[PDB]
Each structure stands twice: as C-alpha cells, then as structure tokens.
Design a protein around this ligand. Structure first.
Ligand SMILES: [Mg+2]
Ligand SMILES: [Mg+2]
Ligand SMILES: [Mg+2]
Ligand SMILES: [Mg+2]
Ligand SMILES: [Mg+2]
Ligand SMILES: [Mg+2]
Ligand SMILES: [Mg+2]
Ligand SMILES: [Mg+2]
Ligand SMILES: [Mg+2]
Ligand SMILES: [Mg+2]
Ligand SMILES: [Mg+2]
Ligand SMILES: [Mg+2]
Ligand SMILES: [Mg+2]
Ligand SMILES: [Mg+2]
Ligand SMILES: [Mg+2]
Ligand SMILES: [Mg+2]
Ligand SMILES: [Mg+2]
Ligand SMILES: [Mg+2]
Ligand SMILES: [Mg+2]
Ligand SMILES: [Mg+2]
Ligand SMILES: [Mg+2]
Ligand SMILES: [Mg+2]
Ligand SMILES: [Mg+2]
Ligand SMILES: [Mg+2]
Ligand SMILES: [Mg+2]
Ligand SMILES: [Mg+2]
Ligand SMILES: [Mg+2]
Ligand SMILES: [Mg+2]
Ligand SMILES: [Mg+2]
Ligand SMILES: [Mg+2]
Ligand SMILES: [Mg+2]
Ligand SMILES: [Mg+2]
Ligand SMILES: [Mg+2]
Ligand SMILES: [Mg+2]
Ligand SMILES: [Mg+2]
Ligand SMILES: [Mg+2]
Lengths: 56, 260, 132, 143, 178
RNA sequence: CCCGUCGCUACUACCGAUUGAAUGGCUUAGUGAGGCCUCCGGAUUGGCGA
RNA sequence: AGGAUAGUGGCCUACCAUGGUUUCAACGGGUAACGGGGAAUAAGGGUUCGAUUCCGGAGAGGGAGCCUGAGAAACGGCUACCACAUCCAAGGAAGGCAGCAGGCGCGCAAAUUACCCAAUCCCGACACGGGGAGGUAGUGACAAUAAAUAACGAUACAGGUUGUAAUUGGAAUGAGUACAAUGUAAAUACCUUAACGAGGAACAAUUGGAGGGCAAGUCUGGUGCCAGCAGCCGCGGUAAUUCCAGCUCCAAAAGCGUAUAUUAAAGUUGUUGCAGUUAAAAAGCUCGUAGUUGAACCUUGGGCUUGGCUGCAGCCGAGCCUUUUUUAC
C-alpha cells in the first residue's frame, strides 16, 4: 500500500490552543473537592446522577 | 578449602551471644581454647556487650592489655579468649568476680560471685584413662588434665578444681538424685535432680530430670552437668531464677506483678 | 537559657580509669549545647578538670529542646590523654592532627619501595652509576 | 472408581500420569521445550534492537480497510528479520532507513494483534528517542 | 556483606479496579476523615485484614489452648490499648467484628479535630503537618499517628507554637515588623 | 451455504546431487612439553662428607 | 597378598573367581541446573523461582604438574603446553580484574578510576603497623516506610440552624536558603536552630482513559473504510459516544503506563478436584507380567476400688478380679 498519506489527519487537524485555567487543587484538597461535589451538594435529577453531563 | 577459617560472619555467630544484626559484617571469632567455639563467650563479648565496660573493640583491647582480666585465676590478654561454662572471670581492679553459668533463658548470665567462691570451679569428667608411665588422669569439660585423681572418679562425675593449684578438692558421683544443670539442647539452663537414667547401647543415654516445681524433662547425658549432691544443695551459686523454667504466660504474669 | 544536664546509666570504670554515662540535655529556647560548653558545665557539676571530660554522640530529639549524648570523665588529664581516641583529643585540643600524605600516595610509595632490595642509598647510587 | 487409581501406594502412578499429561498443556510444553529460546525472534527477551531495512505498508484484514504502516527490521542480536508496527498518526515519518529501533511485542505474546496480518512487534524507540516523545513533540530526533 | 534489613508493604490494592460501590465507599470515608488518597484506606484495610486473620487462626484452636490464650489476650490487649476495641468487648470474637472506621477514629488527625483544636478534619491535618500539635511534651507531625488511651488527654498545641504560647510566626513577624 | 484443482502475492517449515559447509565436547592411534620419583654422574667445596 | 596414602577402600599392582546395576526406570541425552536456608503467589491442596547479604561446593583464560608449608594440587605462588597478549636496541624479558574502581565489547539489561581505618572484625614479632575485608560518601524512581502541593474567617449570593460556589482579609508552614551547633576519622546529609523564604501562594502533578468488559460525554471542531484506533468484541464510507483535537469528566497519584516471564483467576492438569454416548477423548476383541487393589474370622463383656478435670452427672486416666517374629501407621 501507498505510504504517502502517513499522518494525514493529524497534519490537517486545525491547531487549537489549550485555554488557560486556574490550577486544580492537589492531594487531600482534591479528595475534599470530589467528596463535597458527590456527597454534600448532591445534584441528582431525581435519581439520575451523571458525572459528565454534556451540555444539552 | 585450603585451610582454617579466620572470620565469623555476624549472622553465623552463636545466637546466645545476642549480637545485633546491623552493627557490622563480622562477629568475634573465639580463639582456640578450653571451650568449643559454639559454646563459649569471648571476652570481647563479655566486656563490651554484657558488662558494657568497653564501648568498642579498641577499648576492650585497651582494658585487657593492662592485665585486668583473669580467666580461672590466670591473666588472659586474648580479647577473643573462649570463656565457657563454669569459668571464673576476675577483675580485681573493680573487685568483681563472675562465673559463666547458663540462665534458664539459654544465655550466659552475668553472675557475680563472692571472692571465696571464685577460688574454685567445677568440671564434668569427660574421660578417665591412663597416661604415660601408667599414670591415670581425668579430662574435664574445659580441657583440663588432672593427674592422679581419686580412683573412684569416673566419667560424667563432677570434680571440684582448686583453680589455684589445679588439684581436685572433692567430687560428686553421677547418680540418681544429684543436682544437675543442663548444658545443651532446648532444656539448656534448667536445674533439677536426676530421676532415671535410660541407657541405649550404641546410641545416646537419656536422663530424666525433675525440676524443683516438679516439672519433668528429658535431656541427653552429654547435655547433663552434675552441680550438686542433692536438691537445694548446689556446689556453686545458681543464677537468678534457680534454673526454673516458667511458661510465657507465667513470665507475663510475673512481669505484670513485678512492674505493678 | 536554663540548660539542665542529667546523667544516667552511670558506670564507674577503673579498668579505663574513667566514669562513663549517658547525658540528657534540656535546652529550651536553644538549638543545642556545644560539646565545649557541655564539658565546661560537667566540669563544674562534678568538680573535675575540663580536659578530663569527654562528650560525644549527641542527637537532638524531634521538636527540639532536648539532646542526648554520651560522656566520659577521667580521673586525670593524663588518663584522658592515655585512653581517649586521637580524634577526640584533636577535637578537645589535647592533641594535634597528624599530617600524612593521602592514602593513595602512601600505598603508591609502598609499592614503589617494594621494588628495591637493600638500602635506598645503595639503590640510587647504583642507578646514578648506570645512568652516568 | 473415576478412572484413576486410589490406592494408598499408587503415588508413582498418579505422579507419572500427571507428568505425561501436562505435555498437552501448551504453556507447560512451551516452557520446557524452550520454544522462545529456540524459535522466538527475540530469543525470550521483552525487547530487542534492530536496524530499519525498509518502510512497508500492509493492508489490514477484512472487514477493515486501511494501510498499517510498518517497517522491516533486522535484529542486531541474531540477524533475524521481522516486521514491526509503528504506532500512532504519522510516526512513520519519524522512522527512516538504517535507523536503530527498539522493538517490543503487541501484548498477545507471539500472536498478531487486531487486523494487522503477520505482525507481532511494535516500535518503542527510534534513534534512542521514545516514539511517544517524538509523537508528542516532547523531544527531537538526533539528526 | 551486612545482614539484610527487613521491609514490607503496608497496603494492598483491590482486585477489581473499577467498582462503583467500593469507589463510593472509599470516597465517602476519605471525605469523612480528610485522607489524602485511597492508599490510606488500603493501609487500614490491610492491617485489619491481618488482625482478622490472626484472630481467626486463634479461634480455630480450642478454648484454653495455651497459644490461643496467650496470643488472643495480647491481641485484645493491644486493640483495647489503642482504643479500637471497647473495654466490654474483650472476647476475640468482637475483633472479627472490628471495622476500618474504628481505626480511623483513633488517628491523630481525627482526635485533633474532635478535641476542638481544629475547625475541620482538613484543618487538623495541616495543623499536624505544620508542627503545631504535641502529644505529651513531644511534637508529632504524622497525621496517621494512632493515639493511645493514655495519650488521649495529652493532645495539645506545642508549647513553642504560635497557637500554644510561642512567638509569632513568619507572617505575623513580617507584618507587625513593618 | 459451500468444496477442490488452476492463476497472482507473501510467509513458515520439509525433501534434495553437492562423499555440502561451519562451531563445540569426547575419544582410538601416533607424536609428546614439563614436574615428580629413581639411576648413575661429579663443575666446586669442606675436612670421608656436602 | 602387597604397594601407596595421614589413614579405610580396586586407591593402585599380582593372582583368582564372574560378578555388579536395571521398568520400584538402570544407562544415555537435555538443562536457557551450583545445592540448601529461602522467594513470589497463595481458602486448602498446589504452581513457579532461588546467579545474588548466611551455610556447603567449585573456579580463578583452558588443561596438567608441583614447590613451600600444619594446611594449597594455591594461581594478587611456580613449571610446561594451548589460546590471547605487552616491551624489545631482534639478543631477550614479563603476563592473568569470576578482588575494588575503571575501560572495551556484548547486549533490553546494571553506578565513582572518590574518602578512611573512626566502627565490625582479621592478620602480624604487635596496646603502636596493615587491611578496595570492611566502613563513608557519589551515581541510583530496583524495591520498601512515612508524607507537602494548602487551611480558616467576612461579604456576596443560592441553598436547606450550615456545604459549596466568587472577591476580600489577616494568620500558619516547610520545600529552598543560611548563620551556628550537632553529626563525622574529616566531611555530606539527617535532627536541632538565628535572619530570610507564598496569592495566579507561576513554590503552577502526572500517567492513562471516557462504546462494552471497566469508572467516566451520545458535547464542539477536523477527517471521511483515508488517517488512524482497537489486549478481545469492534470503531472509521459527511450529526464518529471509539480516530486527530478543544472542553468537561473518570481512575490511581509522586507516581502512572507499556513489553516479557510467572502466580491467582484455572475444577482449562483435577490427590483434594475435571472430562471421555453425541462437544476432544473407551484400545476392534480377548489373554497376560510387573504395578495397583483384594470377603469374613482370633479378649468381648461384666464387677470393684481409685486419681485428675468441667458444670449429681459428664470427660480422660489408673489398679485389681473375672480361665487372662518382622513391619507399616
Ligand atoms: Mg575462601
Ligand atoms: Mg559412641
Ligand atoms: Mg490401601
Ligand atoms: Mg589391603
Ligand atoms: Mg583386595
Ligand atoms: Mg536417571
Ligand atoms: Mg551452569
Ligand atoms: Mg521468587
Ligand atoms: Mg537454588
Ligand atoms: Mg534453581
Ligand atoms: Mg543459590
Ligand atoms: Mg540471597
Ligand atoms: Mg559463598
Ligand atoms: Mg581452589
Ligand atoms: Mg579473576
Ligand atoms: Mg591457566
Ligand atoms: Mg586467592
Ligand atoms: Mg592453579
Ligand atoms: Mg587478580
Ligand atoms: Mg571489577
Ligand atoms: Mg563476571
Ligand atoms: Mg509542584
Ligand atoms: Mg486515547
Ligand atoms: Mg460505565
Ligand atoms: Mg462531532
Ligand atoms: Mg462530521
Ligand atoms: Mg475525545
Ligand atoms: Mg498502551
Ligand atoms: Mg495458572
Ligand atoms: Mg474440562
Ligand atoms: Mg462429529
Ligand atoms: Mg467425538
Ligand atoms: Mg468397545
Ligand atoms: Mg483379562
Ligand atoms: Mg492390598
Ligand atoms: Mg479384610
């Protein structure tokens, strides 16, 4: 087979820079953040609990 | 391989020396001497690990090169001299006399004795036989050779060595009812009286010993050392504990009561 | 600031002509106490000569305020100079650090000297004769 | 009686029967025959270096349709020639003729992986630089 | 050479990495006790698993067995001493009934928070790590320090700590000194 | 649904004239260093010996 | 019977017999085989590993022969041959890192040509000398332990007396740097500790993933059976939950992934504990030696006294009276 198309999609993928965002806490602070986010202010939609709801 | 070993790895040293693992690669190799390597206690171990008079091997050599240490009434300057069972160590500068007797835990106790008792020692007769010119002699457990012994003395008997003249004061025949300390095996250090000697021609004779607390154990005759003519009458001072073995639960109870 | 010295496990050791003990130093508001100052304090406490006092092996506990080491007090300065290690006498100023070449140089000189039989003067005189 | 001896003195028969029958287990047979030592291209090693001979495109098997971009590598340790897959989008451009590549298996332990036919190795490093580092532009190829 | 020095692992990971019931239980327990990571839960589970294994081994022996009496009493005594086992449950059957929260109750971080020295469990951990807390007259900066019963009453601020009568810290000295 | 010749490509192993080739161990026979023992020998060197 | 040996012995010699081992596996071959203490994994039974901190053996390039000595068939001793290899004035001479460090080579694969006898011990004529044995530091993400990367208030909001989401404060601390003291043979580091040392506290945590197995998107852009992914099942042919990316989320975290081996999962090696009508597998059928395995049967019951331990019973031990050869376990 022809080898001329190697890296075609990655080469032609439009470059997008990573948006600058505040650092996330590390260690115990991060475990605390997940704990509150999942057991303190529960955001369940009456029995429907999703970690990563896509925007819709 | 081509000759005698001169080193002793720390892990391969006798466990009753109670040496620590991480202090070094080697352990004091006992010199040739009256007692076997596995059943001896080098003076470096006694003066540094037991008495803690010396802080290191340089210091134990400094102590002994000043002529302080005597074993069996004779000055020894060999830091790895193999002191053994019933041996008397004298440090007259500190005015201390020790005898190497096993405690019930299997180790050589730091057993201080009076000066009057430090003037003699006991030896188990290993063999009695005739020397040159038809002169009988006795070989004790510490390699001593005493000529012209009492003609009643036989093997497994105990003789009392004057330790200053090397002569025999008196002896104890090996027989039922004699006070005994065990010098080998898992019953090492226990003290009791002979109950019954069970003979095995071509094999090992076994001795049944009853403790002062009426506990009975069996040990090899080669591990049997007569130390007294009867119960409660030892010919040497016994170490603390009197050779009475306590179970671990009894020891825990005793420590609880002793410490509150 | 109120340095307190306690000695425990004291053993009188006439075999080495000294008394030996473990030293506990309570030094609140103080990083630790230097060996020179501990030797001075021990000399005052036990009325011994300072040069007969040796301290070593100190370590500060976790959190500070206390250190533990080991101390020796000899019956005399002569006894201390007789039984003390050289490096400790150099620490205390009772001895001078011996000056020698490095271990590599000493070994190299020994192996060079192993190649000569007889005196060096004879060996070099013969070498001079050969090269002259 | 279940077809095997049960007597108290039949330990020899039981031990020999098990020994005869473990040869039907290919893992045991391959371990004792030493096929990796004798037959495996790597000689039993986890990785192996070699020199890239040529860059070759291999058609994937059905129902997939693609060109898996591999290389022909001659191993330094024994001179054997193997085909090694070059993972990720465009890492073939990182591999040139007469380069020294470190190879490793696909994780199927001697079998081909996926739709790639007859290829049992992958490129881990090229010219002493990790292919992942080159792909992520963490490092550059020494040239 | 020198004799080898012993070392051992103090935890063990689960066999199934992804399990919602265990992940949720672990996260809930870490959030309750302000733990840094899951390994601090694995450590508790590991040492409780071997306490249970020892008790089970003794429980298969007959009652009044010398070994069962000696080692069972020692294990019970140790757990009562560290406060994990209650004084009215010294039977070696309640040892099997022990739970990891019993051990996490006895950590220094938990006891610091429960003694009112900290606002939260996460304040407790930073107080311990920052050398403010002393047990007896000794500073302890290890959060996993298991507090003994005789040590329970002696948990307090270090005497040379800013919160315990020492001088002002770096920030305050820099602020009031300007 | 499906089988087998035949045709293309690639890989693996096999047979095969070449009394093919290379590497290592053991060994017959032949030759055989050197030490040791033995046999004389007797530079020289002490008063018969070395 | 002798010789030889430190000594036994076909160890060797002379003579004489014809013996010795073997399906209970001799002999031969292979071992990517030094043995063991041990190691990994483990419900139990097992499977796999052990060059390597201790013990035993063996070797010092390959063989062989010796000297000295109590002790060596020694190699940091010698002699000779073989293979390598150094200097040479060409006549000759000198070698042995599977010691420490270092180099080349080999390879997937492994560190300083550093300091010291202070400790552990050893050797010597020895209180004193020596020891790359050993110790110390260097390199070192082999493994292992502990354990930072933030904590707390007020406003503002949302919220059901308090959990957060933001912009506003004052505290706390060690990473690092350093007087100093300690440590140490001397240092380094640790431990202590003046002064300095945090708001984006830029003093900025990573490695893999988000279809299922398997925890976490049917978000947006790019490509369009290409590029690629994918352990396996599969994804990709114009709204791709799977590729390339951004965002978000998930898992473990100073660690995380990949390859290979191995163990569990594997009752897919099955003694415990598999299967054999049809899924793989009962020999075409009988005989038969080793092996394995083999019916029942020989002092039972009764009586009396007594010791101990569990709460009158029960459980063990006894001692008398009743006619009273070889193993295996
Ligand atoms: Mg050796
Ligand atoms: Mg005999
Ligand atoms: Mg049977
Ligand atoms: Mg003979
Ligand atoms: Mg014969
Ligand atoms: Mg065989
Ligand atoms: Mg081998
Ligand atoms: Mg292993
Ligand atoms: Mg092995
Ligand atoms: Mg092995
Ligand atoms: Mg081994
Ligand atoms: Mg080992
Ligand atoms: Mg060895
Ligand atoms: Mg040898
Ligand atoms: Mg070598
Ligand atoms: Mg050679
Ligand atoms: Mg040698
Ligand atoms: Mg040799
Ligand atoms: Mg050498
Ligand atoms: Mg080397
Ligand atoms: Mg080597
Ligand atoms: Mg950081
Ligand atoms: Mg991915
Ligand atoms: Mg899911
Ligand atoms: Mg899209
Ligand atoms: Mg699209
Ligand atoms: Mg994505
Ligand atoms: Mg991967
Ligand atoms: Mg398995
Ligand atoms: Mg089956
Ligand atoms: Mg069929
Ligand atoms: Mg069938
Ligand atoms: Mg049939
Ligand atoms: Mg039949
Ligand atoms: Mg039978
Ligand atoms: Mg029968």
């Amino acid at each position: 087979g022809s080898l001329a198309r190697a890296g075609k999609v990655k080469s032609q993928t439009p470059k997008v820079e990573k948006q600058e965002k505040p650092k996330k806490p590390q260690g115990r602070a991060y475990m605390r953040l997940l704990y509150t986010r999942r057991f303190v202010n529960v955001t369940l939609t009456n029995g429907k609990r999703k970690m990563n709801p896509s925007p819709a | 391989a081509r000759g005698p070993k001169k080193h002793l790895k720390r892990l391969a040293a006798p466990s009753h020396w109670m040496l620590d693992k991480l202090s070094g690669t080697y352990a004091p190799r006992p010199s040739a001497g009256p007692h076997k390597l596995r059943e001896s206690l080098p003076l470096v171990v006694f003066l540094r690990n037991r008495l803690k008079y010396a802080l290191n091997g340089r210091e134990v050599k400094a102590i002994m090169m000043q002529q302080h240490v005597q074993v069996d009434g004779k000055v020894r300057t060999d830091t790895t001299y193999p002191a053994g069972f019933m041996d008397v160590i004298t440090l007259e500068a500190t005015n201390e006399h020790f005898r190497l007797v096993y405690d019930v835990k299997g180790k050589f106790a730091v057993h201080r004795i009076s000066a009057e008792e430090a003037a003699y020692k006991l030896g188990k007769v290993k063999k009695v036989q005739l020397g040159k010119k038809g002169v009988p002699y006795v070989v004790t457990h510490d390699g001593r050779t005493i000529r012209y012994p009492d003609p009643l003395i036989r093997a497994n008997d105990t003789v009392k060595i004057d330790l200053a003249t090397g002569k025999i004061d008196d002896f104890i025949k090996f027989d039922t009812g004699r006070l005994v300390m065990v010098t080998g095996g898992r019953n090492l250090g226990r003290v009791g009286v002979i109950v019954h000697r069970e003979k095995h021609e071509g094999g090992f004779d076994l001795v049944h010993i009853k403790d002062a607390l009426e506990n009975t154990f069996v040990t090899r005759l080669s591990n049997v050392f007569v130390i007294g003519t009867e119960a409660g009458k030892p010919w040497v001072s016994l170490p603390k504990g009197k050779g009475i073995k306590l179970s671990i639960s009894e020891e825990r109870d005793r420590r609880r009561a002793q410490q509150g | 600031d109120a340095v307190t010295i306690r000695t425990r496990k004291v053993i009188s050791n006439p075999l080495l002509a000294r008394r030996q003990f473990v030293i506990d130093v309570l030094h609140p508001n103080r990083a630790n106490v230097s060996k020179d100052e501990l030797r001075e304090k021990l000399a005052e406490i036990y009325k011994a000569e300072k040069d007969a006092v040796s301290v070593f092996g100190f370590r500060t506990q976790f959190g500070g305020g206390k250190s533990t080491g080991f101390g020796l007090i000899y019956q005399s300065v002569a006894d201390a100079k007789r039984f003390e290690p050289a490096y400790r006498l150099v620490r205390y100023g009772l001895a001078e650090k011996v000056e020698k070449a490095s271990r590599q140089q000493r070994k190299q000189k020994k192996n060079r000297d192993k190649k000569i039989f007889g005196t060096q003067r004879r060996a070099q005189k013969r070498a001079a004769r050969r090269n002259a | 009686g279940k077809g095997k001896p049960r007597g108290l003195n039949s330990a020899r028969k039981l031990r020999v029967h098990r020994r005869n029958n473990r040869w039907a287990d290919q893992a045991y047979k391959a371990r004792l025959l030493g096929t990796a030592f004798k037959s495996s291209p790597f000689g039993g090693s986890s990785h192996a270096k070699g020199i890239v001979l040529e860059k070759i495109g291999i058609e994937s098997k059905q129902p997939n349709s693609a060109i898996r971009k591999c290389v022909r590598v001659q191993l330094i340790k024994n001179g054997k020639k193997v085909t090694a897959f070059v993972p990720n989008d465009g890492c073939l451009n990182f591999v040139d003729e007469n380069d020294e590549v470190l190879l490793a298996g696909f994780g199927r332990r001697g079998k081909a992986k996926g739709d790639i036919p007859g290829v049992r190795f992958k490129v881990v490093k090229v010219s002493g630089v990790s292919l992942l580092a080159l792909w992520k532009e963490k490092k550059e190829k020494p040239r | 050479p020198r004799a080898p020095r012993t070392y051992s692992k103090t935890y063990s990971v689960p066999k199934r990495p992804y399990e919602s019931a265990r992940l949720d239980a672990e996260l809930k327990l870490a959030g309750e006790y302000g733990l840094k990571n899951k390994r601090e839960i694995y450590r508790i589970g590991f040492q409780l698993s071997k306490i249970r294994r020892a008790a089970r081994d003794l429980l298969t022996r007959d009652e009044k067995d010398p070994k069962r009496l000696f080692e069972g009493n020692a294990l019970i005594r140790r757990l009562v001493r560290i406060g994990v086992l209650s004084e009215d449950k010294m039977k070696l059957d309640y040892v099997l009934a022990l739970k990891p929260e019993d051990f996490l109750e006895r950590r220094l971080q938990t006891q610091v928070f429960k003694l009112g020295l900290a606002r939260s469990i996460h304040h407790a951990r930073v107080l311990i790590t920052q050398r403010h807390i002393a047990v007896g007259k000794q500073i302890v900066n290890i959060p996993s320090f298991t507090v003994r019963l005789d040590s329970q009453k002696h948990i307090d601020f270090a005497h040379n700590s800013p919160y315990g009568g020492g001088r002002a810290g770096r920030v305050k000295r820099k602020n009031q000194g300007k």
